[PDB]
mmCIF file of C-alpha atoms and ligand atoms in Angstrom:
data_model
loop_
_atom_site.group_PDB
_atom_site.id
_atom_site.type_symbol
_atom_site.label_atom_id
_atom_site.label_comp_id
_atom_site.label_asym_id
_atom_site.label_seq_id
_atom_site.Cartn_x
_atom_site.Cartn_y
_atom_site.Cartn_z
ATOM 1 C CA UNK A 1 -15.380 112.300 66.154
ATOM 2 C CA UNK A 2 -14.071 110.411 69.210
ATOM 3 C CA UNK A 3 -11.203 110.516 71.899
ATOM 4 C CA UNK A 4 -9.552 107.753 69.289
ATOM 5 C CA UNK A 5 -10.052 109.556 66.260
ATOM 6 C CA UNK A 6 -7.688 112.412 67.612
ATOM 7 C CA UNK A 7 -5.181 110.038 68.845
ATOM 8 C CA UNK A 8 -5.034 108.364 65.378
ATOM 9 C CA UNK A 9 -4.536 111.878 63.797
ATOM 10 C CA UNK A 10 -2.065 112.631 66.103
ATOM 11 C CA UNK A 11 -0.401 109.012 65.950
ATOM 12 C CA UNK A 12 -0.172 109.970 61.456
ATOM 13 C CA UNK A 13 1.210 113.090 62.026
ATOM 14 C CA UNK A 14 3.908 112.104 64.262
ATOM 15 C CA UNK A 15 5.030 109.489 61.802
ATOM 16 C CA UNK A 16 4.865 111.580 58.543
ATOM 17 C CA UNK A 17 6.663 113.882 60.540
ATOM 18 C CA UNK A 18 9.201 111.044 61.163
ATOM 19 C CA UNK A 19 9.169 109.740 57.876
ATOM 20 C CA UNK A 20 10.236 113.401 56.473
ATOM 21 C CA UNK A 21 12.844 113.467 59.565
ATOM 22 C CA UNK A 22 14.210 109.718 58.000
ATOM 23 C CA UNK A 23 14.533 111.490 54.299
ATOM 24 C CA UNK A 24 16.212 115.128 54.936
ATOM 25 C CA UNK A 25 18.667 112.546 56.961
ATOM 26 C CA UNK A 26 19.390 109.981 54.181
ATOM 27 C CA UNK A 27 20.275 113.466 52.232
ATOM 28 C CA UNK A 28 22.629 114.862 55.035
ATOM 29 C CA UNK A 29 24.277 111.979 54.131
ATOM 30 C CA UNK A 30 24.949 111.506 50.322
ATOM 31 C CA UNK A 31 21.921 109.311 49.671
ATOM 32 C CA UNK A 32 21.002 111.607 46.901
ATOM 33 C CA UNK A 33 19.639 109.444 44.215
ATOM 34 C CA UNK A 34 16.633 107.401 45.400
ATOM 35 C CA UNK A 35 13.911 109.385 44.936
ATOM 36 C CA UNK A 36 11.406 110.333 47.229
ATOM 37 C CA UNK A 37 7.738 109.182 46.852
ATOM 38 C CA UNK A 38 4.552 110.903 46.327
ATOM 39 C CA UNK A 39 3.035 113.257 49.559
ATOM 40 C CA UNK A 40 1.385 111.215 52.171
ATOM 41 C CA UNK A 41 -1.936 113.694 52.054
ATOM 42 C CA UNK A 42 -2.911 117.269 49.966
ATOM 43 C CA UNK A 43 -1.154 118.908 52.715
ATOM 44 C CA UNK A 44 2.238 117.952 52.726
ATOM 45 C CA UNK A 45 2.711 118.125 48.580
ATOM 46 C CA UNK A 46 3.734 121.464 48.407
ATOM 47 C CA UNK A 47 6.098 120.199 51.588
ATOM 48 C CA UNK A 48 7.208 117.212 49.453
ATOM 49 C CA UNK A 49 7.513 119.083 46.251
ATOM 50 C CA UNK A 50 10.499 121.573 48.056
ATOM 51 C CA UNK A 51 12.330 118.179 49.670
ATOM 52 C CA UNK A 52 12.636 117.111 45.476
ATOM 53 C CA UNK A 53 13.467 120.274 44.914
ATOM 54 C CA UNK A 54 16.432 120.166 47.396
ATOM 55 C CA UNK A 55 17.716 116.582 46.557
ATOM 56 C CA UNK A 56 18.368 118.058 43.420
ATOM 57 C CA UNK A 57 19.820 120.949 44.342
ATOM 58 C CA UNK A 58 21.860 119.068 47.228
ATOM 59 C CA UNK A 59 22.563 116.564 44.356
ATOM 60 C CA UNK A 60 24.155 119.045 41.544
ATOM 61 C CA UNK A 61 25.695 121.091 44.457
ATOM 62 C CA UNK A 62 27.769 117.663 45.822
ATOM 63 C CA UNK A 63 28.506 117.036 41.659
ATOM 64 C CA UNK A 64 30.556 120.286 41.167
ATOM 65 C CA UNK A 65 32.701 120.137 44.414
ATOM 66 C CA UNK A 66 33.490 116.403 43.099
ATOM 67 C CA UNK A 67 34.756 118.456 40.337
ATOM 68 C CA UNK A 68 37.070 120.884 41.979
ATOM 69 C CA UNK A 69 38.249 117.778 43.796
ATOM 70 C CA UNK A 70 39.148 116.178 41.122
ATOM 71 C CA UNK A 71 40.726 119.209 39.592
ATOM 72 C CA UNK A 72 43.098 120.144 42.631
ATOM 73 C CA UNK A 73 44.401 116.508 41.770
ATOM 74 C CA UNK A 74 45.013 116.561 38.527
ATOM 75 C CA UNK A 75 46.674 120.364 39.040
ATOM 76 C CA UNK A 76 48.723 118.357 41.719
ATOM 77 C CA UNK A 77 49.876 115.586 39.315
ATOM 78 C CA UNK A 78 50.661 118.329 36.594
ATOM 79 C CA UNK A 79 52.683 119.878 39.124
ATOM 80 C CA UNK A 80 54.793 117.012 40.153
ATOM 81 C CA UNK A 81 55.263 116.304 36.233
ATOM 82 C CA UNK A 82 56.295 119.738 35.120
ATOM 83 C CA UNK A 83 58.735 119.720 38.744
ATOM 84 C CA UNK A 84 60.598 116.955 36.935
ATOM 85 C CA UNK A 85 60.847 118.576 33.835
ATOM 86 C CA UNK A 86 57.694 116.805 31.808
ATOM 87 C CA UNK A 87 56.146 119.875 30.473
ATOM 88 C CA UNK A 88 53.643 118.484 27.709
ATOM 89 C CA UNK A 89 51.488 116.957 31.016
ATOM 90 C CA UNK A 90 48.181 119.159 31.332
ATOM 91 C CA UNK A 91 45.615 118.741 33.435
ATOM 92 C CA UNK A 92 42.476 116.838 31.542
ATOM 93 C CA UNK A 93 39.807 119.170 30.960
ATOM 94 C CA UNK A 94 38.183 116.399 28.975
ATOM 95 C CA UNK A 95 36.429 114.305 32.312
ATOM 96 C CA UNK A 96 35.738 117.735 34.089
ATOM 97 C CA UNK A 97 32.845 119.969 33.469
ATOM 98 C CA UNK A 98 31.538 123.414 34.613
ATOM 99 C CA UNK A 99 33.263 125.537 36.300
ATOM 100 C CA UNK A 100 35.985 123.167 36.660
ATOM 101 C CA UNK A 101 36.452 122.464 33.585
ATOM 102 C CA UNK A 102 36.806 125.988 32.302
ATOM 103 C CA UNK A 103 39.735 126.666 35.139
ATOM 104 C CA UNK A 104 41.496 123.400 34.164
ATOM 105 C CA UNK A 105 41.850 125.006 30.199
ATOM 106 C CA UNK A 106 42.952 128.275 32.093
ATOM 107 C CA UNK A 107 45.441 126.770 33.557
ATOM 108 C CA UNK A 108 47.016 125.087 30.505
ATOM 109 C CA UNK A 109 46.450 127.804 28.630
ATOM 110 C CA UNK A 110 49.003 130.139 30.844
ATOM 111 C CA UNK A 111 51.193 127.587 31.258
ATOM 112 C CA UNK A 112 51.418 127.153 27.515
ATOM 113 C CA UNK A 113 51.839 131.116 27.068
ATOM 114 C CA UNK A 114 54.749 130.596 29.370
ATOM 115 C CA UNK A 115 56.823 127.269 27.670
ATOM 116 C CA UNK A 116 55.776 128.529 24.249
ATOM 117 C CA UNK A 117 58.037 132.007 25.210
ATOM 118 C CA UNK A 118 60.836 129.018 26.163
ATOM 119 C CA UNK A 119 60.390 127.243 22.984
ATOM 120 C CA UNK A 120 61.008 130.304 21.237
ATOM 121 C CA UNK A 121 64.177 130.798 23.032
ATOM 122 C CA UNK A 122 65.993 127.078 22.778
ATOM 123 C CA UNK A 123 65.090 127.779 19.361
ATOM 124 C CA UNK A 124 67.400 131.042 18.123
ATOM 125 C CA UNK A 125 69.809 130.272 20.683
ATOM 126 C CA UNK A 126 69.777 126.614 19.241
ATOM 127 C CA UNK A 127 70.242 128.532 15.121
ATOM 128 C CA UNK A 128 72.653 130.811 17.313
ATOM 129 C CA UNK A 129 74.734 127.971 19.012
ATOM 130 C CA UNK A 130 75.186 126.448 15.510
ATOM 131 C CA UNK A 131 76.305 129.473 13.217
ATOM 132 C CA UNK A 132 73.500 131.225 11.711
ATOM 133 C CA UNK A 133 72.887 134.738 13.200
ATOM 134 C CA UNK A 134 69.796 135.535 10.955
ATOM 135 C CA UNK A 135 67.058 134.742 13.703
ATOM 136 C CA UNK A 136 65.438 137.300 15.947
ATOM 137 C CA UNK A 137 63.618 136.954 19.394
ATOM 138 C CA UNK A 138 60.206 137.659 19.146
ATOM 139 C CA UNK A 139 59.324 141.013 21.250
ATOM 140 C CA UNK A 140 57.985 140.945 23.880
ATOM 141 C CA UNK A 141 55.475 143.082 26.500
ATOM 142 C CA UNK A 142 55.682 143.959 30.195
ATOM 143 C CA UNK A 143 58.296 142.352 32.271
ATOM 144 C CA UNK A 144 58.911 139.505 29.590
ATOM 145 C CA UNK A 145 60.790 142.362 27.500
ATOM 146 C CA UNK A 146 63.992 141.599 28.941
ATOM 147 C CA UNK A 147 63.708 137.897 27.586
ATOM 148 C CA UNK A 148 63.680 140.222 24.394
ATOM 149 C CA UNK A 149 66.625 142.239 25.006
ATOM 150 C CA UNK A 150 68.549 139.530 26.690
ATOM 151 C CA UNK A 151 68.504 137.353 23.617
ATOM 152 C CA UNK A 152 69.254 140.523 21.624
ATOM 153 C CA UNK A 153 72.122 141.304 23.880
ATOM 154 C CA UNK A 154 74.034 137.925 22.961
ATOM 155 C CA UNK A 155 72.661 138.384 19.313
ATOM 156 C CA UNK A 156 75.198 141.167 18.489
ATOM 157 C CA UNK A 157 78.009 139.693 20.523
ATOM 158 C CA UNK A 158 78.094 137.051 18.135
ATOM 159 C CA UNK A 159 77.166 138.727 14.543
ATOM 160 C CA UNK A 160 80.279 141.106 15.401
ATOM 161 C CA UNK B 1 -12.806 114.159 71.571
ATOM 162 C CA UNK B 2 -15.180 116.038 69.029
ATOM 163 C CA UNK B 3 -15.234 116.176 65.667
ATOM 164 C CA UNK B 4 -14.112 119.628 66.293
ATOM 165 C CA UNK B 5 -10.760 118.408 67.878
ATOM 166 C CA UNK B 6 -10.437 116.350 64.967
ATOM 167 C CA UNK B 7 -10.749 118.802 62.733
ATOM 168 C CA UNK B 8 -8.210 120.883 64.436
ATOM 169 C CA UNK B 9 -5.435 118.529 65.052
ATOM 170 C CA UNK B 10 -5.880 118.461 61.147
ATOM 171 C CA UNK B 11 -5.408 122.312 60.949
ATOM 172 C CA UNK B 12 -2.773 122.204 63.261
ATOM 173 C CA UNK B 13 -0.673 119.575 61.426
ATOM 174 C CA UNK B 14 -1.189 121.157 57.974
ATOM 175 C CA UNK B 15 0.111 124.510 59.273
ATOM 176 C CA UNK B 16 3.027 123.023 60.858
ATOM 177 C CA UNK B 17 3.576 121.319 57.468
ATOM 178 C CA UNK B 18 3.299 124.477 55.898
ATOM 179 C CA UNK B 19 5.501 126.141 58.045
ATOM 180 C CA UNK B 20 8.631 122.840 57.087
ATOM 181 C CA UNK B 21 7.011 123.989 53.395
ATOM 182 C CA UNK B 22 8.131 127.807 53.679
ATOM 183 C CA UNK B 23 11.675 126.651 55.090
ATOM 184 C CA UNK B 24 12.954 124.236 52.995
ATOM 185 C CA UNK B 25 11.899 126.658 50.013
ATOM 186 C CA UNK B 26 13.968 129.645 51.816
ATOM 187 C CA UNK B 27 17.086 127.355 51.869
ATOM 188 C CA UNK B 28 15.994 126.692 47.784
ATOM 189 C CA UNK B 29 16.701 130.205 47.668
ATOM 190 C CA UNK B 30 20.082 131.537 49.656
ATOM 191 C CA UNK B 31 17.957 132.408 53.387
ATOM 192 C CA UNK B 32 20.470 130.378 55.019
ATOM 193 C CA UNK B 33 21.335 133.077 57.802
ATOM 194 C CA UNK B 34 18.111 133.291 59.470
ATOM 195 C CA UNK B 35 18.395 130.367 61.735
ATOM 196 C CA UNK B 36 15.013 128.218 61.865
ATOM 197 C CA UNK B 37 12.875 128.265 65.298
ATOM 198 C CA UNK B 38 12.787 125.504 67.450
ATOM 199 C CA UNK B 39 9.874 122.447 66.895
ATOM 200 C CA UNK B 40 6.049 122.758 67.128
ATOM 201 C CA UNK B 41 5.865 119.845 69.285
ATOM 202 C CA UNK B 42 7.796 116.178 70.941
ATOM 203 C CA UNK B 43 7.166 114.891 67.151
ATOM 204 C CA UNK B 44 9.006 117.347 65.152
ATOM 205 C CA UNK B 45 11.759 117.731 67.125
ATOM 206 C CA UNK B 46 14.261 115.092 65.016
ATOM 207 C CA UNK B 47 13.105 116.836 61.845
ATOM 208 C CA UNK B 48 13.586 120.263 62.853
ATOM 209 C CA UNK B 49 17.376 118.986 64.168
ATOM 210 C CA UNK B 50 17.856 117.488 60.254
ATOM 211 C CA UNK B 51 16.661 121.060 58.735
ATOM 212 C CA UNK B 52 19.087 122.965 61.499
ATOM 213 C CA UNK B 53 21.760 120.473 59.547
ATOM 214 C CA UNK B 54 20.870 121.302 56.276
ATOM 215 C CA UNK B 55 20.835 124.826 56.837
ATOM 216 C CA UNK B 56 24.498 124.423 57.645
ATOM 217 C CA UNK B 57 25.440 122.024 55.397
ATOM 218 C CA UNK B 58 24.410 124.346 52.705
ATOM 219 C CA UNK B 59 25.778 127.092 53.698
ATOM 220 C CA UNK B 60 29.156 125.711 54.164
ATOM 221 C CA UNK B 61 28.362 124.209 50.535
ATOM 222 C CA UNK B 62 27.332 127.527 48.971
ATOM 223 C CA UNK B 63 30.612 129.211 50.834
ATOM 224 C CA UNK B 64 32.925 126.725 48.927
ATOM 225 C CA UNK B 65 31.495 127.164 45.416
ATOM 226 C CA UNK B 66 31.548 130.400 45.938
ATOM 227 C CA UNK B 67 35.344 130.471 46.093
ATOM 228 C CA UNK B 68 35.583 128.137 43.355
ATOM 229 C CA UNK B 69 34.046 131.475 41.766
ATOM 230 C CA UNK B 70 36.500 133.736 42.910
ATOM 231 C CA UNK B 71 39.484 131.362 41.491
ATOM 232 C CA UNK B 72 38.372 131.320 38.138
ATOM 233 C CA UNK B 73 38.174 135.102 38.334
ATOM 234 C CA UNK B 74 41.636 135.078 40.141
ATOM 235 C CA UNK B 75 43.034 133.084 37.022
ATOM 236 C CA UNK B 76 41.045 134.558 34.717
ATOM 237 C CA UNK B 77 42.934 138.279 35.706
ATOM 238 C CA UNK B 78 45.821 135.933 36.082
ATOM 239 C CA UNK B 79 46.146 135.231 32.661
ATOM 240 C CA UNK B 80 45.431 138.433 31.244
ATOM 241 C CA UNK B 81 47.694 140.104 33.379
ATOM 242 C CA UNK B 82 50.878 137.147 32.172
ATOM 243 C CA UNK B 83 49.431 137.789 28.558
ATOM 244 C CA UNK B 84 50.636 140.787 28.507
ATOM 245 C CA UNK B 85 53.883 140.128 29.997
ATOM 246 C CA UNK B 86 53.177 141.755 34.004
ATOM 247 C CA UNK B 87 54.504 137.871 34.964
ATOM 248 C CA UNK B 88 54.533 139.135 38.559
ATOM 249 C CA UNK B 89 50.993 138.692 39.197
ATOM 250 C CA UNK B 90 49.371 136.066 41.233
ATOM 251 C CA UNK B 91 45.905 134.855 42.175
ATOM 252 C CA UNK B 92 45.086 136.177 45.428
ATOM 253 C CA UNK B 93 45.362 132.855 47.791
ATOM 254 C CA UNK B 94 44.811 135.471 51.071
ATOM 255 C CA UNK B 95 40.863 136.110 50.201
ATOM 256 C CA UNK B 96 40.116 132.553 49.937
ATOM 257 C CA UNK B 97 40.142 128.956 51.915
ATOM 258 C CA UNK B 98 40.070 125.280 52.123
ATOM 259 C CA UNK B 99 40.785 123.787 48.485
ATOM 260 C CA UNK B 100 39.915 126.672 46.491
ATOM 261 C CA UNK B 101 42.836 128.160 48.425
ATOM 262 C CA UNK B 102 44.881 125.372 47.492
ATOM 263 C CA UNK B 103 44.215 125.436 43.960
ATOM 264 C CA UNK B 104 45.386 128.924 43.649
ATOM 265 C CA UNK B 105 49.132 128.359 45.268
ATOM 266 C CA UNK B 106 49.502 125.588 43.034
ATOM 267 C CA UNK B 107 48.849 127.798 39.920
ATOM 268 C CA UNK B 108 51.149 130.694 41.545
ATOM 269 C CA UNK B 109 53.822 127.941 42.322
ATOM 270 C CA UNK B 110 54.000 126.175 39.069
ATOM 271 C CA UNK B 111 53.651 129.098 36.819
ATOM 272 C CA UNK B 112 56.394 130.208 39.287
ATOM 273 C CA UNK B 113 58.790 127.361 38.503
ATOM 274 C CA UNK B 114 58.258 128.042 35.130
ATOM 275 C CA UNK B 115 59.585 131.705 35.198
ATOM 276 C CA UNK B 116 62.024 130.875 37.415
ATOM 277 C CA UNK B 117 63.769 129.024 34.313
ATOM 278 C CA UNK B 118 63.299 132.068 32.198
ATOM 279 C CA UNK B 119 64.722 133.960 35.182
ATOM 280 C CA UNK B 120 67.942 131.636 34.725
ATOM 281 C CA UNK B 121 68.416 131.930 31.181
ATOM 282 C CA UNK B 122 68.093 135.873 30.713
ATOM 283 C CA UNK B 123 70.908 135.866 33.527
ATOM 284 C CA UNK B 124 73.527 133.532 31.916
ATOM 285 C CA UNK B 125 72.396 134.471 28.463
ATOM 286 C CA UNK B 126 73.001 138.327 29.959
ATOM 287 C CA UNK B 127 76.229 137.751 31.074
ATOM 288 C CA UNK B 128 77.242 135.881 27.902
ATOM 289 C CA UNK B 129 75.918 139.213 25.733
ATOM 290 C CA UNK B 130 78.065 141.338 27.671
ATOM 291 C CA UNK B 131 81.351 139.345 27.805
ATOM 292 C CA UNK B 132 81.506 136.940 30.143
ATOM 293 C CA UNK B 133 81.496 133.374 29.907
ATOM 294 C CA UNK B 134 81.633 131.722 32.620
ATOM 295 C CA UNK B 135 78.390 131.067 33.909
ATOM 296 C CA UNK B 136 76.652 127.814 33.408
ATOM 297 C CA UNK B 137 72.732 127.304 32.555
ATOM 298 C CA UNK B 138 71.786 124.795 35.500
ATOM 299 C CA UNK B 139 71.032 121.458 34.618
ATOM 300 C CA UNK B 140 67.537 120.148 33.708
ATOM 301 C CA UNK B 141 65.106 117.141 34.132
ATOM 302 C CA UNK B 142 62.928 115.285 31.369
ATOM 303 C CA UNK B 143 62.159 118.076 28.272
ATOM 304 C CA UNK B 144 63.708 121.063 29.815
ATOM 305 C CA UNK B 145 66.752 119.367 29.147
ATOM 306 C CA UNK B 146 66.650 121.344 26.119
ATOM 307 C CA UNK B 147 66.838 124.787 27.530
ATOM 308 C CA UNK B 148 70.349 123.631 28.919
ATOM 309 C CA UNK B 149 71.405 122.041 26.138
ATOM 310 C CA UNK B 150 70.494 125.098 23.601
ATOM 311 C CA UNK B 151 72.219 127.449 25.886
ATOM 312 C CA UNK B 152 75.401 125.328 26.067
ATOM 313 C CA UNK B 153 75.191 125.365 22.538
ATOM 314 C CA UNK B 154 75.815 129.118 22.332
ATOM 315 C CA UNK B 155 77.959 128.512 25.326
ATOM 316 C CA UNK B 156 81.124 126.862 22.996
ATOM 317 C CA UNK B 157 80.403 128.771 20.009
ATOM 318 C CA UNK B 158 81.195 132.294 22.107
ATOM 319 C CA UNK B 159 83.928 130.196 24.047
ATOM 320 C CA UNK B 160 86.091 129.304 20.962
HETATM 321 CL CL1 LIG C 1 -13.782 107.434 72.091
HETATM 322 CL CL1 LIG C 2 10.174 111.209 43.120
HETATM 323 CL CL1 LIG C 3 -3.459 117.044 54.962
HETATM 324 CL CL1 LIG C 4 -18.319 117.885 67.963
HETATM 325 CL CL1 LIG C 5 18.038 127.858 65.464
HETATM 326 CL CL1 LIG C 6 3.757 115.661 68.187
#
């Protein structure tokens, strides 16, 4: 209606403006949780619903690469115990979720595969080493074969 | 001045609104290539630098979980592959980066020190098949202490 009027329009926009500038900042920097409020005017709601949209998404997004932080740790400390010969150490699956979580059991789970071969091994060597011939390494497939054969090999030189 | 230029700065500021709208929902949905313009005006110009930085930050963001992605997969084949005995295979450190990169040469080296064990014993327990005993299993920390205790085990009862 007046000179004023358009100023004043002018003087709102510039500060919802800055107020949206103040709350994509607080997320380029972690503050994820406070929400935001409720759209200054009809126009800006759609506006406002996308910026809850993306604290959410910047929210779960920050969440999983905790996770895969958490988990090159914890494959780091199973390392380091397994290097000094503690090989019952896994990495806890149990406080990781996801993604994470799913490679953390994959990672036990082959390393298991492999000391399980080894446990099978001390074993008829151990029945071996005290007497008792009887025993027989279990077979195995691919390259893991001549674990087979190998035990086989020092099976006969003993029962004859 | 007018009611009219009222009215317009109104029009103006709800399409520039709209135009922030249409953005933040093409970074809700992977457009993170197509770099945004530059600001309508003096008064957007901070906000438009924040949505520049988002852009990149989730890129970068959606980059990393991506390979977190690929190393599951990686393991995943991984496992299979050890499963069925083809212990030679690795996950594929080269096609990734940053942590999930790290993750995967920690799998490759532990599994690693675990074979190299095996390695060990189907040599001495090779040569002690085929004659031979001279060789001694290596000595070894916390529970593999077993593996070189079982093999000397066998190691007296071939050697008197
Ligand atoms: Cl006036
Ligand atoms: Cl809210
Ligand atoms: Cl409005
Ligand atoms: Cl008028
Ligand atoms: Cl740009
Ligand atoms: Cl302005």
């Amino acid at each position: 209606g007046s000179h004023m009027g358009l100023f004043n329009a002018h003087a709102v926009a510039q500060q919802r403006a800055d107020r949206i500038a103040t709350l994509l900042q607080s997320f380029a920097d972690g503050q994820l949780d406070t929400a935001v409020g409720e759209a200054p005017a009809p126009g800006y709601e759609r506006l406002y619903d996308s910026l809850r949209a993306l604290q959410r998404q910047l929210r779960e997004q920050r969440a999983e690469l905790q996770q895969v932080e958490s988990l090159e740790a914890g494959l780091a400390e199973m390392s380091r115990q397994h290097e000094a010969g503690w090989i019952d150490q896994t990495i806890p699956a149990e406080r990781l979720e996801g993604r994470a979580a799913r490679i953390a059991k994959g990672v036990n789970e082959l390393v298991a595969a492999h000391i399980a071969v080894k446990m099978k091994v001390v074993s008829v060597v151990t029945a071996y080493g005290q007497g008792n011939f009887e025993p027989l390494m279990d077979r195995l497939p691919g390259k893991k074969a001549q674990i087979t054969e190998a035990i086989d090999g020092v099976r006969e030189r003993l029962r004859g």
